[PDB]
Amino acid sequence: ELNDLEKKYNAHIGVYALDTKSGKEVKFNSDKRFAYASTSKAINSAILLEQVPYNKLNKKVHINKDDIVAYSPILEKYVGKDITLKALIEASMTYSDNTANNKIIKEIGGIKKVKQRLKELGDKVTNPDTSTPAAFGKTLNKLIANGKLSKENKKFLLDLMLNNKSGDTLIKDGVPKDYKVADKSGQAITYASRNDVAFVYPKGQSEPIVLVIFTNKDNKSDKPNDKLISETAKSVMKEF
Amino acid sequence: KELNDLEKKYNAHIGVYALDTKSGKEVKFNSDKRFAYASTSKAINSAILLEQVPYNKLNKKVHINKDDIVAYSPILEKYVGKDITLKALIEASMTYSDNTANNKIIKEIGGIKKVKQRLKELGDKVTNPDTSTPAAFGKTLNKLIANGKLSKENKKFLLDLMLNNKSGDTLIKDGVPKDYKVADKSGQAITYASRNDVAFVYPKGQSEPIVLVIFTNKDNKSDKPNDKLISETAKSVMKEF
Ligand SMILES: [Cl-]
């Protein structure tokens, strides 16, 4: 199980899983801080979807040269063009586009308005760099799984997660055939697979198990442990 | 135990130097042997910058571009096209062992040539950017951080990071007594089996620390490192104080 997986891999593992149907929790270093990478992009996209209706997603934003930052694969092709908010959220959620994320936060009212929304949600732990498995899972439940998003803005966002290929070797490989997973992978720039979060849907249950899995090796940037994350998922899934 | 025997038990090479800065008492075992180190040197570089920047001035910001980014930069990869302060680069280098934060701290000092010159000046003529010895690295952390020139502010800012470091848990912090306070920085090579820990151990009742340096590598480099070795080395060495 989980401390044997610390030994097995020589990694640290932080888990927080929450069945929202029953209130049941699985923890393990839940109150320890990890650097979570692009999984914050799922938060920033849902807070803008709280304020913009699905029909108003056809608003264009103008992209100019100074707006573009490194590791933007879609938005580097938009210097001096306009793009809808919808296509900014697909680029940030499918490609982890950095320019798309910056424009989505600009559009929320700057990072202070994101910080403040989290204080309102009751998360005094998450900051743009690090959070704990526990803080993050609760924020994800309150904002996406049991939040205030319209039927249509929440199907839009979950289908981007449901149809994402990035972490089919992480929580997705780890659960049984018949569970459906909607995940936001870490897809970190400078080091290999380390984080993954998901909404796991039991076959015959509409409510999700929220599952946060943050891991740390330290200093080995090209070794992914896709299998430390799918093993940790398997063992967690027993509890439900 | 004996240290000779832990090498025998875990099939490892151990280098260790301990100095009680209160009495002046040293423990040595493979002291003058050279080991290639990595992230334990981030605490040396953090201490040379805090020697020329007053704590109130740590809010100064540097701009990050794509070309500063290097591999395993857990925190700074989220800052391309952004500024970050100097108190924040040091916390990312010390807490998360971020490599863009370390390189930017070295550039602030004035580069590797001024890190060299500073060591030379502290009397360390052994350490180079590649290897060092347990004895050289131990006298250098003592002369820069425990009996150095840092302000009170900056010496507690730096040790609080090392004290609340969750990546050194399975190493020195795990082998000492229950009421020994341990402030450390870990390190481990990428390409072969190697595991290091340097620390400032505070025995109950004394405010002077023991400086502990433990360098280790498995005799078969293809072997997975075992954190237990550092833990058990630390336990033996502490019995000598
Ligand atoms: Cl990641």
Give the span between the Cα atoms of A207 and A182, in whole angstroms: 13
Q: All domains of chain B, ordered by start, with CATH?
A: 1-241 (3.40.710.10)
Per-residue DSSP letter, A113: H
Residue of B78, B100, B229 to mutate, interface with A, max A Cβ within 10 Å: B78
The tokens describing A34, both together, are 């990890």
Helix runs in chain A, H state only: 2-9, 41-49, 85-95, 98-108, 111-121, 133-140, 151-162, 171-174, 226-236
Q: Among residues B240, B168, B214, which one has the least CA distance to residue B33? A: B214
Distance A145 CA to ligand 1 centre (A): 22
- The answer to whether the CB of A216 falls within 8 A of the CB of A11 is yes
- Name residues with Cβ closer than 5 Å to ligand 1, which is an ion: A 37, 186, 188, 194-195
The tokens describing B11, both together, are 């099939």
Tell me the technique behind this structure. X-ray
Declared resolution, Å: 2.3
Residues in chain B within 8 Å Cβ distance of A216:
167
Distances (CA, A) of A40 to A106, A111, A184, B26, B84: 15, 12, 9, 49, 19
| Catalytic choice (A22, A30, A38, A150) | A38
- The answer to whether the CB of A105 falls within 8 A of the CB of A10 is no
- The answer to whether the CB of B145 falls within 8 A of the CB of B155 is yes
The set of residues, in sequence order, having a beta carbon less than 8 Å from that of A56 and lying 6+ positions away, is A85
Residue list for the binding site of B for substrate: 185-187
Residues in chain A within 8 Å Cβ distance of B38:
219
The tokens describing A217, both together, are 């090796």
B196: part of which helix (H) or strand (E)?
A: strand B194-202
The answer to whether the CB atoms of B72 and A98 lie below 8 A apart is no
Three-class DSSP category at A153: helix
Q: Which of A128, A188, A219 lies closest to B188 in CB terms?
A: A219
Q: Among residues A130, A131, A41, A142, which one has the least CA distance to residue A91? A: A41
- The answer to whether the CB of B135 falls within 8 A of the CB of B212 is no
b/e per residue B168-203 (b: at least 16 CB within 10 A): bebbbbbbbeeebebbbbbbbbeeebbbbbbbbbbb
CB-based burial of residue B34 (10 Å sphere; 0-12 exposed, 13-18 middle, 19+ buried)?
middle
The set of residues, in sequence order, having a beta carbon less than 8 Å from that of B90 and lying 6+ positions away, is B46, B49, B50, B58, B101, B105, B157, B158, B161
The set of residues, in sequence order, having a beta carbon less than 8 Å from that of B60 and lying 6+ positions away, is B53, B85, B86
Residue list for the binding site of B: 185-187
Residue B210: strand pairing partners: B20, B201
- The answer to whether the CB of A115 falls within 8 A of the CB of A91 is no
Residue list for the binding site of A for substrate: 184-186
The answer to whether the CB atoms of A33 and B225 lie below 8 A apart is no
Q: Which of A10, A12, A191 lies closest to B224 in CB terms?
A: A10
Give the span between the Cα atoms of A217 and B241, in whole angstroms: 33
The set of residues, in sequence order, having a beta carbon less than 8 Å from that of B205 and lying 6+ positions away, is none
User: What phi-psi label fits residue B88: left (phi over 0), alpha (psi between -120 and 50 degrees) or beta?
Assistant: left
Residues in chain B within 8 Å Cβ distance of A70:
65-66, 69, 80-81
Residue of B72, B161, B170 to mutate, interface with A, max A Cβ within 10 Å: B72
Q: Has A230 been annotated as catalytic?
A: no
Give the span between the Cα atoms of B149 and B147, in whole angstroms: 7
Residues in chain B within 8 Å Cβ distance of A192:
none
Cβ neighbours of B57 (radius 10 Å):
11
What's the sign of the alpha-carbon dihedral A217, A27, A41, B92?
A: negative
Give the span between the Cα atoms of B211 and B146, in whole angstroms: 8
